[PDB]
Amino acid sequence: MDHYLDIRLRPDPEFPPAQLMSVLFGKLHQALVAQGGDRIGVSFPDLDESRSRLGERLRIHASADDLRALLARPWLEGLRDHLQFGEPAVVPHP
RNA sequence: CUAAGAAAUUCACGGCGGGCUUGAUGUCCGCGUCUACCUGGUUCACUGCCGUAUAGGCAG
C-alpha cells in the first residue's frame, strides 16, 4: 500500500557495503520454504553503469500483507517509539 | 643551415711437454623480546538441477 518509508542518508556501523549489499535482500525471510506468507516484492530503481558498479542504495518495494498479517510474532519490532512519524508520502502517479 | 658536408681494415695460422703443497692446534662465558588487533573488501571452475539462437517445474 501507501505505508512505505525511506530513511535519509546516514552512515550505518552495522552493514558493510562490500560483498553482501546486493545479495541478502530477502534471504532472511521464510519465502524459500513458503510455509506461511508468500508475498514479497523485489525492485531495483538504480540502473547506473559507469565503472564496475550497478546498484548501491536500498529502495525495494514489498507487498501490503507482509507488514500487517505476517508480523503477529516479534520479528521486526522493538523500534516502535523511536521517532514521531511526520507528513505522509504519496504513491507516485507517474 | 649542427668542428657542417665524405669514407670497406683484410687475407692465413698446432701453445706444448712435466710435476708430492705439507706438518701442528681448547672459541668461551653471561643474558626477560614485549604489549594490542573483525580479513563483516572482490583470497583456481570437488562424481546425482530435460538443447549457443535471447525460449522452459531452483521445501539448496
Residue A49: strand, helix, or coil: coil
Helices then strands, each counted (H, E), chain A? 1, 0
Closest CA to A85 of A1, A12, A5: A5
- Cα–Cα distances in Å, from A76 out to A32, A71, A72, A73, A80? 19, 7, 10, 9, 10
Q: What is the resolution of this structure in A?
A: 2.6
Which of A87, A80, A67 minimizes the C-alpha distance to A1?
A: A67
All structural domains of chain A with their residue ranges: 3-94
Q: Which nucleotides of B are covered by protein (CB under 7 A)?
A: 40-42, 59-60
CA distance linking residue A83 with residue A59, whole number of Å: 21
CA A54 from centre of chain: 18
Q: ∠A7-A59-A84 over CA atoms, to 5°?
A: 25
> What torsion do the CA atoms of A55, A89, A86, A59 make, to the nearest 10 degrees?
-10
Reported CATH class of domain A3-94: alpha beta
Structure method: cryo-EM
CA A35, A15, A60, A86: dihedral to nearest 10 degrees?
A: 110
Q: What does the block give as the cell for A45? A: 530503481
Q: Cβ of residue A20 near strand B, that is under 7 Å?
A: yes
User: Given A3, A29, A82, A93, which residue is catalytic?
Assistant: A29
